[PDB]
Amino acid sequence: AELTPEVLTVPLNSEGKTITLTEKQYLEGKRLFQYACASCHVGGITKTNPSLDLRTETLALATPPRDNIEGLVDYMKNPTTYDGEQEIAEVHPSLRSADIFPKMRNLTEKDLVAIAGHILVEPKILGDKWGGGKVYY
Amino acid sequence: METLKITVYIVVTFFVLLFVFGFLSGDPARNPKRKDLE
Amino acid sequence: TTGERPFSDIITSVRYWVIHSITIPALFIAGWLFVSTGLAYDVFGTPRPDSYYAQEQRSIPLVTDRFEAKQQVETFLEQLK
Amino acid sequence: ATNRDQESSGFAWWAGNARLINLSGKLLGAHVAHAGLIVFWAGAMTLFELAHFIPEKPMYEQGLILIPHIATLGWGVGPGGEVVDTFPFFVVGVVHLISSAVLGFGGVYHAIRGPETLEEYSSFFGYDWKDKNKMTTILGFHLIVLGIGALLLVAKAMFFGGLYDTWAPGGGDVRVITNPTLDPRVIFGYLLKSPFGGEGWIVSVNNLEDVVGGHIWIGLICIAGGIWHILTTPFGWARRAFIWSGEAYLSYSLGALSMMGFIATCFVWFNNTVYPSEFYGPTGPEASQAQAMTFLIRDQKLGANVGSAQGPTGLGKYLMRSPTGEIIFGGETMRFWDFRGPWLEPLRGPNGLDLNKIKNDIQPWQERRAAEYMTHAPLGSLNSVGGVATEINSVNFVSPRSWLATSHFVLAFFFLVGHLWHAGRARAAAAGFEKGIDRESEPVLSMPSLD
Amino acid sequence: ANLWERFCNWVTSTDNRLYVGWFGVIMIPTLLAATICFVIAFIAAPPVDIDGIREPVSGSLLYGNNIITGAVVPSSNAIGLHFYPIWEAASLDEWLYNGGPYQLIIFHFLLGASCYMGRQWELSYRLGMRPWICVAYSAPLASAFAVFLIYPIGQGSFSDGMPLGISGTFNFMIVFQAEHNILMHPFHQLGVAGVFGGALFCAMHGSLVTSSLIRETTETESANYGYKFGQEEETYNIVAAHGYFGRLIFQYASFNNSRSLHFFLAAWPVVGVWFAALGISTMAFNLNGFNFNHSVIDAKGNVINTWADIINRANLGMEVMHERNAHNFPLDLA
Amino acid sequence: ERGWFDILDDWLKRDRFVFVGWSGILLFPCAYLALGGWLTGTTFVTSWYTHGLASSYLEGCNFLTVAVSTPANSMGHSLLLLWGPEAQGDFTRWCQLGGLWTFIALHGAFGLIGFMLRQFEIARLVGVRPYNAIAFSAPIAVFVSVFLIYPLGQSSWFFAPSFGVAAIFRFLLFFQGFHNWTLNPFHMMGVAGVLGGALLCAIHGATVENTLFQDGEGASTFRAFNPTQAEETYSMVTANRFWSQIFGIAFSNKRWLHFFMLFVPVTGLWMSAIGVVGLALNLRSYDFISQEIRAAEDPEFETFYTKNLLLNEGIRAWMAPQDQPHENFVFPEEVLPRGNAL
Numbered sequence A: 001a002e003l004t005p006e007v008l009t010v011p012l013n014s015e016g017k018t019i020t021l022t023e024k025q026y027l028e029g030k031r032l033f034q035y036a037c038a039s040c041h042v043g044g045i046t047k048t049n050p051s052l053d054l055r056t057e058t059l060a061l062a063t064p065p066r067d068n069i070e071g072l073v074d075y076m077k078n079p080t081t082y083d084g085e086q087e088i089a090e091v092h093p094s095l096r097s098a099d100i101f102p103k104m105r106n107l108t109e110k111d112l113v114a115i116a117g118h119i120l121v122e123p124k125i126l127g128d129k130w131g132g133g134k135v136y137y
Numbered sequence B: 001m002e003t004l005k006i007t008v009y010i011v012v013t014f015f016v017l018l019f020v021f022g023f024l025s026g027d028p029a030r031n032p033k034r035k036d037l038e
Numbered sequence C: 001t002t003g004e005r006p007f008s009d010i011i012t013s014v015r016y017w018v019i020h021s022i023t024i025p026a027l028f029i030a031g032w033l034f035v036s037t038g039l040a041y042d043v044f045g046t047p048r049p050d051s052y053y054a055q056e057q058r059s060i061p062l063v064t065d066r067f068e069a070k071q072q073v074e075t076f077l078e079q080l081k
Numbered sequence D: 001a002t003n004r005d006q007e008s009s010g011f012a013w014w015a016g017n018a019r020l021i022n023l024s025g026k027l028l029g030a031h032v033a034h035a036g037l038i039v040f041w042a043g044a045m046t047l048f049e050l051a052h053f054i055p056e057k058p059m060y061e062q063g064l065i066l067i068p069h070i071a072t073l074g075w076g077v078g079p080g081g082e083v084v085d086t087f088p089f090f091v092v093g094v095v096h097l098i099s100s101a102v103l104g105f106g107g108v109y110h111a112i113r114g115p116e117t118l119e120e121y122s123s124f125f126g127y128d129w130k131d132k133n134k135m136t137t138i139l140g141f142h143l144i145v146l147g148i149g150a151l152l153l154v155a156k157a158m159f160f161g162g163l164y165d166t167w168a169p170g171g172g173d174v175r176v177i178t179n180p181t182l183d184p185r186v187i188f189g190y191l192l193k194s195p196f197g198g199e200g201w202i203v204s205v206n207n208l209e210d211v212v213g214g215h216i217w218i219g220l221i222c223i224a225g226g227i228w229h230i231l232t233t234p235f236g237w238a239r240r241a242f243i244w245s246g247e248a249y250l251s252y253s254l255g256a257l258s259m260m261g262f263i264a265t266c267f268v269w270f271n272n273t274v275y276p277s278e279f280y281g282p283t284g285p286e287a288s289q290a291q292a293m294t295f296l297i298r299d300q301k302l303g304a305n306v307g308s309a310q311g312p313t314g315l316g317k318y319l320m321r322s323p324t325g326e327i328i329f330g331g332e333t334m335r336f337w338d339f340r341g342p343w344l345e346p347l348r349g350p351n352g353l354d355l356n357k358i359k360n361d362i363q364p365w366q367e368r369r370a371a372e373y374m375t376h377a378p379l380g381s382l383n384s385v386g387g388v389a390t391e392i393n394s395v396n397f398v399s400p401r402s403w404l405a406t407s408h409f410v411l412a413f414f415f416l417v418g419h420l421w422h423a424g425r426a427r428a429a430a431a432g433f434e435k436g437i438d439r440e441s442e443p444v445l446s447m448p449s450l451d
Numbered sequence E: 001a002n003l004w005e006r007f008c009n010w011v012t013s014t015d016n017r018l019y020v021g022w023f024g025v026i027m028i029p030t031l032l033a034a035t036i037c038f039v040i041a042f043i044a045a046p047p048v049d050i051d052g053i054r055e056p057v058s059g060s061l062l063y064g065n066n067i068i069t070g071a072v073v074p075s076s077n078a079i080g081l082h083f084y085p086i087w088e089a090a091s092l093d094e095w096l097y098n099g100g101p102y103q104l105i106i107f108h109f110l111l112g113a114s115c116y117m118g119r120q121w122e123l124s125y126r127l128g129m130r131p132w133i134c135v136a137y138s139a140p141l142a143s144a145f146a147v148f149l150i151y152p153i154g155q156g157s158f159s160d161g162m163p164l165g166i167s168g169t170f171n172f173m174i175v176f177q178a179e180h181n182i183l184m185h186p187f188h189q190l191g192v193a194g195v196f197g198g199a200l201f202c203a204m205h206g207s208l209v210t211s212s213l214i215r216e217t218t219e220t221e222s223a224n225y226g227y228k229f230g231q232e233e234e235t236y237n238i239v240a241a242h243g244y245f246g247r248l249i250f251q252y253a254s255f256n257n258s259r260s261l262h263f264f265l266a267a268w269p270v271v272g273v274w275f276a277a278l279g280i281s282t283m284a285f286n287l288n289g290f291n292f293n294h295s296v297i298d299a300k301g302n303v304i305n306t307w308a309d310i311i312n313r314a315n316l317g318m319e320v321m322h323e324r325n326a327h328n329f330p331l332d333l334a
Numbered sequence F: 001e002r003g004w005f006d007i008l009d010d011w012l013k014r015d016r017f018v019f020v021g022w023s024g025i026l027l028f029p030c031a032y033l034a035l036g037g038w039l040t041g042t043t044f045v046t047s048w049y050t051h052g053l054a055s056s057y058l059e060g061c062n063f064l065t066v067a068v069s070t071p072a073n074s075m076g077h078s079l080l081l082l083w084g085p086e087a088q089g090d091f092t093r094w095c096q097l098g099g100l101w102t103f104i105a106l107h108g109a110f111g112l113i114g115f116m117l118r119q120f121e122i123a124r125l126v127g128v129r130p131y132n133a134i135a136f137s138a139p140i141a142v143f144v145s146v147f148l149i150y151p152l153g154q155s156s157w158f159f160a161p162s163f164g165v166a167a168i169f170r171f172l173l174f175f176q177g178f179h180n181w182t183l184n185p186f187h188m189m190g191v192a193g194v195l196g197g198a199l200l201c202a203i204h205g206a207t208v209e210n211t212l213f214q215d216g217e218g219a220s221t222f223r224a225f226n227p228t229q230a231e232e233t234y235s236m237v238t239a240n241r242f243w244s245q246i247f248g249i250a251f252s253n254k255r256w257l258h259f260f261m262l263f264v265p266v267t268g269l270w271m272s273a274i275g276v277v278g279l280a281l282n283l284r285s286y287d288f289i290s291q292e293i294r295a296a297e298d299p300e301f302e303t304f305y306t307k308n309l310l311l312n313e314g315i316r317a318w319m320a321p322q323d324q325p326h327e328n329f330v331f332p333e334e335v336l337p338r339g340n341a342l
């Protein structure tokens, strides 16, 4: 098994358009995700709220859908609750709240794309492990 | 309980005083060889 | 003592070093190439990082028969495209 | 080449430094050179930390232990402990490093080139271990120096920028201490507190006025004591109690240092005042409390009435009483109810956690802080995989508090061992039997049978 | 001779059948207190709410235990590191429910055993011996401090201290493995080398000395009668022992100096057990064993399991089951 | 009567740097092969086809996680000879099927026999009593019971210990969860023997070192000893008084002291060996029946015994599927035992 271009091809937007990441983009995504996100989202779960995970199936049912690059990038800019009803930037790291979550200050658009790509590709590799929790360790 | 507390406090103080004053009472000289250790 | 030349005597002699400053690095390089040419993988039948699994498979190629184990392994290896 | 082999000195190479016991010049060299090593490490480590430092990551995610020390003193940081200027760190590094050269020079000079003994060279710098007067005078000098050191911290707090105050209103900030606690009742009151849970002895100090005032008392005490010891010589009762020899003094200091090492371990583990969590990460108790807080906030947002939620045991799921009645967080964290931190205290009322404040007054900054500390609990593996022992690889993290506490427990322990070793040996050597039992005079043979 | 002098002479007397001494002055009452309370508690103490969740655990013989399962149960998690002497309880019944006996026993015991170390030094000094036996004793003593005091201090509760019983010990060990992966910690490994090695060298030294006993007896008598207490001559031939062991390995892997040898026999297990103790004491502050969970990954990014991951599965089994009613929130942070 | 046998005997018993002897003919190849096998395996050989595990440096494992793993459970108790019906002479397949495990274990066993024979042979040549060999009976019993007998009572070599640091740790945890081995009185006697042994080692060493006669002027006391001196180097009389007064009782007989130092750890290991022989048949000290009856009927009754059982049940459920791949255990999340929250 290898990290092929097929694996690295993910939904760009809701309309079904895809983008193909490079191995470098994917690895950069992993590194950045470890840097800014993993303290809470290690392995695709959420430590401070285990009800919501980062499985693609979950992201697809968020409002608005987050199972694609644009959705995730927007989320990292202006995060909402799962139903889209509330803006939670004040308690969730984002570009909108980079003043209170300083690690978000040195993240660029390219970086948000990388992180998104990592979040979408990982489940294609790890299957149930991603979002699965200790049961699948 | 208060009586128990005072009893223990006194007992402990007594024994600790024995320990301290004990080692203060020319202890280095209590060895079998050289006695002049001051 | 039991007669052999004492180790201190030997390992501080120039001749010992003349021989071993060659023989030692040469073995090290032979060991290096044994891995680096990928020959070790083929000799011991150890998977390279891309040969543990078929691209879409997630099942372990576990040996399950005693007398057909060899053929099982050969088959699992075939199935790696 | 005096005393530089086993034949002349009586000591094998593996106890080689014992050959230095009566060579005051060379011993001075060893000490100055060693001090050189200490200062060197301070400088170099500081520069290393600075070069690996990213201002927008919390310090505690970066393996830092010296920078947090500098930031606590008030240099380089602003409100909330944000780093505003790394230059002071740089200075502190560079200066320490430069100084280490001077000390090094001194060390080496005294060690190999200078006078091997000092007694003939100078009656002032020269000393006999058995001269009680000289020893107490040297001791006096060093006490005076320590006193000045303690006063320096006070000078920083009161006249040179202040200190970082995690407890300062509006989030942490650097603050000038204008009125240090001078009331001896308070100051030594700390000294008389139980070391057990909820009391915590001197580890319990939780405001900077007490720290500063305590250091004023310490400075005056040290200076006065140094003068006392310069001007006097040990009394008869003291004279009869101690062994008067170099190894004996060493052993006394070894006990001292062990004790201090253990205290330091507890200080860094529990205290979040002089070890601010902004810099060092949350304490263990702090992170546990923070998890409880996090889930109370989450479930309350979902509609739970947290005050009345009964957990599976029958104890409150979120809130319960402490053995003396105070309203506290539930779950295992019941053990950590003695925790006090600036992020939690606004929810506190006279009876402990206030349900109304919990319901109405929880700010987003508090939720943030609880989430952060909960996810930076001081648990992690030896190869720095953060989290519980069963966690997968991903997060490169071990807390500064763990590193510091563990290191210092190990050191304190081995220093206690060193104390036993050297005190026992000092006793045996003063009495005359450290090399073994004299056959022609074996004491036990001159003693009656036990039975 | 005045009474104080007379007393001091009796206390420090090398003629007492058991040496008392100044350390013994603290040691005797404290160990007696610990011992008496331990015995009564082990037999007759009612169940104790160890984990603070009103789920009392039965530790005594009268309440359904045998020698193997019985324990003096650690004090309540609600108490934490708080000091809980008898006089702090409203009644003995409260005190017993909450695990007071555990605290009384371990504080008295630790004080007493420390004074035991001291007393070893003390008697060595009265007898004109060299002073370092107590240093060897500091290794098992530090270990007792680790599991009864240091670890509770780090975890924030005496409820996490080692229970005073056999099965309780096993429990403590299993939970320790779940929370710190102690098996993967280098200090526990050095500890194991310390004790396995200690046992090895014990048997070794014993067997070599025994193998080289000089013939002083007939076959119908115990060879032990060939040594007489106090005799000046050595009872075995260290040159023959050395000749044999030297041939077994090679000459320079064998000790011919008895002082050097015996020092080695002291040093190996003491040093190893020191590390073992330091392990427990440092895992007390949650610096845990090596974590190689998911360390080996394939080209695609699949997790390739190693033996470390199997260990992780077992540890997870321990973690999820331990203290099954005590956790309300998803992370076990203490 | 000096024929080739006696000339060969002559050569074998030369006083050289490394003694050979007749026993060396067995010992040396077997010890070398078992060691070389382990080094080869841990460096180059996988456990993918037998366990679904990486186990070599080549695959990225470190010294703690490398192993020569047991063969697949499907091999049973096959000798797994290279020229056998499974590998059929194919070295590579043979490595993949776990042949190195039986290679190492068997050469290891014969190697151990060789070493004990060496102890006997040298003892007989030098003229000492053979107590060292006798003491070595204990490691042999342990090895034979744990690496040979135990798997032979089980389904296959798979359940024997695997030769690696972490692999052995897993063996420990498996024995706790499945066998409740800490509850076994034979294990307990083993522990007593080992810890008591370490204790005797330390206390004897420290005692000797702290009752030395001053036989020299130096502060380093090691020099003041000569291997051929007749006198004891330390005072047994002072040692005896010290211990009598500290601990109540003391040794007075040196020969007995050293015999006891042989006896304690040797006996401990032999006891633990008997218990493992029991575990070969799953004849465990798992439960106390009275406890289970009381606990079954009375849900307020709890001891450390029942607590430890809950832990065992956890270990079994969470580790079984990955640890025993050939069983194809599928345990849905819902059947997994878990306490609250965790």
Ligand code: CLA
Residues within 6 Å of the ligand: D002, D003, D004, D005, D012, D013, D014, D015, D016, D017, D018, D019, D020, D023, D026, D027, D029, D030, D031, D033, D034, D101, D104, D105, D108, D111, D112
């Ligand atoms: C902090 C560590 C430390 C320090 C400061 C010392 C210091 C000393 N040792 Mg000790 N020692 C140590 C650790 C240390 N030791 C350790 C770990 C061991 C175990 C191996 C020993 C074993 C030992 C023995 C057996 C002996 C000593 C002796 C000495 C003394 C004389 C050494 C000498 O003359 O050699 C001369 C060596 C040289 C000339 C070679 C170079 C030495 C220089 C100083 C190194 C400088 C390098 C540095 C980068 C230069 C910077 C210059 C720059 C600042 C401008 C000296 C005071 C001797 C003694 O007691 O004398 C009475 C002695 O016999 N030591």
Ligand code: CLA
Residues within 6 Å of the ligand: D028, D032, D102, D103, D105, D106, D107, D109, D110, D114, D115, D118, D121, D122, D125
């Ligand atoms: C541990 C501290 C220490 C002590 C007690 C000594 C003691 C001695 N030194 Mg040494 N030395 C040291 C460190 C020390 N030195 C250092 C760090 C260096 C490098 C600069 C030297 C370089 C040196 C040389 C080249 C010589 C000596 C000499 C001497 C002897 C004569 C000193 C004298 O009469 O000066 C009189 C006192 C003064 C001149 C006061 C000077 C005050 C200083 C310079 C200002 C700063 C003081 C302040 C407290 C510094 C704080 C430092 C702190 C942060 C660590 C005396 C035995 C001489 C000797 O051995 O004779 C044969 C000699 O030739 N020293």
Ligand code: CLA
Residues within 6 Å of the ligand: B020, D136, D143, D191, D192, D221, D222, D223, D224, D225, D226, D228, D229, D232, D233, D234, D235, D238, D241
């Ligand atoms: C570096 C620190 C230091 C050292 C090593 C010394 C050393 C000495 N002092 Mg000095 N002293 C110092 C600082 C120091 N002093 C300072 C700063 C002051 C001003 C406060 C003094 C004021 C002073 C006076 C007035 C006297 C001494 C005396 C002495 C000598 C006797 C020591 C003794 O018997 O203690 C033994 C310890 C005790 C007697 C303490 C009481 C026993 C308790 C129960 C021990 C337990 C304490 C406990 C473990 C602590 C826990 C914390 C606690 C505070 C709650 C000894 C040479 C004596 C002397 O001979 O002077 C010439 C003397 O009369 N000192």
Ligand code: CLA
Residues within 6 Å of the ligand: D049, D052, D062, D063, D064, D065, D382, D384, D400, D403, D404, D407, D408, D410, D414, E271
């Ligand atoms: C109190 C001392 C102390 C503390 C608390 C720390 C803590 C830390 N260091 Mg620092 N450091 C120190 C001293 C200390 N260090 C010293 C003396 C040096 C010079 C060698 C350094 C040079 C240094 C570098 C270059 C780096 C660190 C880093 C770190 C961080 C990661 C540590 C790690 O991963 O280690 C791994 C753990 C070990 C290696 C365990 C060591 C086990 C030892 C050998 C046991 C010894 C026991 C005892 C002393 C022996 C007794 C023997 C007996 C017979 C008597 C951590 C915050 C890293 C970092 O993140 O920087 C930002 C980093 O890159 N440190």
Ligand code: CLA
Residues within 6 Å of the ligand: D013, D014, D015, D016, D017, D018, D250, D254, D414, D415, D416, D417, D418, D419, D421, D422, D425
């Ligand atoms: C400030 C503290 C201090 C000072 C000044 C001394 C001074 C002395 N000690 Mg003491 N000692 C101390 C603390 C101290 N000790 C402590 C804390 C312990 C407990 C472990 C001891 C235990 C001890 C023993 C058992 C003995 C001494 C002895 C001595 C004398 C000779 C020492 C020597 O030459 O060592 C030479 C130095 C070495 C041989 C090297 C030691 C190497 C260590 C183990 C390295 C540790 C690893 C490192 C921390 C990390 C790894 C680094 C690596 C990867 C490169 C000398 C007076 C001897 C004596 O009795 O003289 C009368 C002696 O027998 N000491």
Ligand code: CLA
Residues within 6 Å of the ligand: F025, F026, F029, F030, F033, F079, F080, F081, F082, F083, F099, F102, F103, F104, F106, F107, F110
């Ligand atoms: C010298 C001591 C020694 C001993 C005791 C062993 C023992 C063993 N080896 Mg090892 N081995 C050794 C040295 C040794 N080896 C050396 C030097 C090498 C490198 C060449 C090897 C390389 C090796 C490999 C590759 C393998 C073994 C294996 C084995 C095991 C099975 C051996 C077997 O069944 O042979 C049986 C052979 C005999 C019993 C010879 C006896 C001859 C009798 C007494 C005389 C009759 C012979 C007759 C005249 C011949 C007629 C032939 C005709 C009918 C065709 C056994 C544990 C196997 C294994 O470990 O599987 C797990 C295996 O695969 N060995």
Ligand SMILES: CC1=C(/C=C/C(C)=C/C=C/C(C)=C/C=C/C=C(C)/C=C/C=C(C)/C=C/C2=C(C)CCCC2(C)C)C(C)(C)CCC1
Residues within 6 Å of the ligand: D029, D030, D033, D034, D036, D037, D040, D094, D097, D098, D100, D101, D103, D104, D105, D107, D108, D111
């Ligand atoms: C005696 C003795 C000894 C010891 C010694 C010692 C301990 C010494 C030390 C010494 C020392 C302690 C030294 C030091 C030095 C230092 C230096 C020399 C420094 C320099 C620095 C610099 C040059 C800097 C630079 C810089 C800057 C300025 C900026 C930033 C960056 C950098 C870093 C680049 C021994 C053991 C051998 C033994 C024998 C005897």
Ligand SMILES: CC1=C(/C=C/C(C)=C/C=C/C(C)=C/C=C/C=C(C)/C=C/C=C(C)/C=C/C2=C(C)CCCC2(C)C)C(C)(C)CCC1
Residues within 6 Å of the ligand: F032, F033, F035, F036, F037, F038, F039, F040
């Ligand atoms: C199996 C087999 C065989 C055999 C083979 C062999 C015999 C091999 C050998 C091999 C070898 C023989 C190898 C070796 C190796 C070694 C190594 C790999 C080492 C390493 C080391 C190190 C790394 C070190 C470390 C250390 C320590 C340990 C301590 C001290 C310090 C140090 C750190 C140095 C045969 C062919 C018969 C057949 C087939 C099967």
Ligand SMILES: CCCCCCCCCCCCO[C@@H]1O[C@H](CO)[C@@H](O[C@H]2O[C@H](CO)[C@@H](O)[C@H](O)[C@H]2O)[C@H](O)[C@H]1O
Residues within 6 Å of the ligand: B020, B021, B024, B025, B026, B027, B029, D236, D237, D240, E004, E005, E008
């Ligand atoms: C709470 C802790 C209290 C600590 C108090 C510390 C105070 C220090 C000074 C106390 C007075 C010292 O008192 C000390 O003990 C006894 C009291 O009879 C004296 O008397 C002693 O004389 C010699 C000393 O060689 C002994 O053999 C004898 O047994 C004893 O009578 C000591 O000579 C004296 O040195």
Ligand SMILES: [Cl-]
Residues within 6 Å of the ligand: D330, D331, D332, D333, E326, E327, E328, E329
């Ligand atoms: Cl909880």
